[PDB]
Symmetry: C3
Amino acid sequence: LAEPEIAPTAYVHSFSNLIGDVRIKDYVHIAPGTSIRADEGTPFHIGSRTNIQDGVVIHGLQQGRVIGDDGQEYSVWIGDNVSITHMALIHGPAYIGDGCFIGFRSTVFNARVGAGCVVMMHVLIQDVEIPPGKYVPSGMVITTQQQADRLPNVEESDIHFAQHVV
Amino acid sequence: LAEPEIAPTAYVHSFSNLIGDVRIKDYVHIAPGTSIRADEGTPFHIGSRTNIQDGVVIHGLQQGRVIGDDGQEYSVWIGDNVSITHMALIHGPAYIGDGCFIGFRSTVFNARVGAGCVVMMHVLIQDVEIPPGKYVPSGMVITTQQQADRLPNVEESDIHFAQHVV
Amino acid sequence: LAEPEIAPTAYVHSFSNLIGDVRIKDYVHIAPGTSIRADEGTPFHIGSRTNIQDGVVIHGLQQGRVIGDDGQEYSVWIGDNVSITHMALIHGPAYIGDGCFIGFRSTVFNARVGAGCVVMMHVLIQDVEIPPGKYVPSGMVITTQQQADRLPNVEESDIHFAQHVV
Ligand SMILES: [Cl-]
Ligand SMILES: [Cl-]
Ligand SMILES: [Cl-]
Ligand SMILES: [Cl-]
Ligand SMILES: [Zn+2]
Ligand SMILES: [Zn+2]
Ligand SMILES: [Zn+2]
């Protein structure tokens, strides 16, 4: 496999299982207890200032890609200023836009989550595109575009909540 | 504890925490980031060509067994050609039949899942017997036999989905 | 960081990622595959005879504390005789009282769970106080005090179930 590209100012805990063509940008913080393996789906991108918390798995299917902001194909693209919180599963093909909060134990698989979404806890997002700036309440199972298209907009209190957590 | 029995053609990543009387058959693939410990409930069986993905825990209660295809008691029996996908929890006593797909973050505990089931994501299956060839949609919490007995049959698109993932 | 205080009779598996001011009392059993890091929120308390099972993460927010039984502030307080079962997430600020069962894949975050509760599988408890002696059925997402105030009392069969698991 290709080697990870780890920006000089990124922090990757030595316990993180980081493998393959994972392109990690400035000031990223990858916690212990994480698995970020581009051994099937590849490449991955993790944007600047993004935090990957303990218990997260990031993996990808061999087949299936999203377009990154650079126009290249990725198995997983996670933007800048994103929080991928404890036990989240981000499984390629997946795009998560800048500034998103992905709350505890939530999954994004075969999906695009627009910039500035606040996804709460114990959520499944699969097989859909979530527009930018949407809020997903805890426990929601979003598997159809019809559901995704009904989601509420992020409110000030949702932004406040996310900022408080991270 | 007894030692694992690892078939010559099985692959067990060195990071896997594999302990006790775990009987692993031909062409099994056990990923890093897995825990498969027969230190309480024992023994375990993992059938040929089965894949155990990163984030899975397989454990068992000291008391409580299922009958394997060989007539012996097991804490956990997982058949041939099974996919135990990321973050699944298979907790003995448990039987999972040949050809099952167990989707991301799903749990099987004190239960039997018949051959050829397609269990989707964020599912709980507990205290029930799922007949062969049933589909469990994402997010379902199955804790009574009445619920298990209402499940739909696997359709071609469910089989196609599972094959595409694995 | 301060060092953990590990009681002489506590068992902490060498694979456990245990960091910071974590105060572990008599006869505690911490499994492999656990993460218990007081590197942000701190301190933590884990009471006597409590079991932390494989797959659990215990972490805390930098800001936000609960009052322990000793009157001191904690990020996470887990009482005596508690079972924190596989893949549970206990995230500070959090208080879990003596004798609680926290079932598989359940989360307690920014919440107080009174002594003697039986919390089942795939539960979220967030932003609430659960009174002592309440039962939370599997799959419940408890995010408001109104929901918490409707919970049923633990019955003999719930106690029997918990004892049987642990
Ligand atoms: Cl973390
Ligand atoms: Cl999980
Ligand atoms: Cl894997
Ligand atoms: Cl354990
Ligand atoms: Zn995968
Ligand atoms: Zn167990
Ligand atoms: Zn945390």
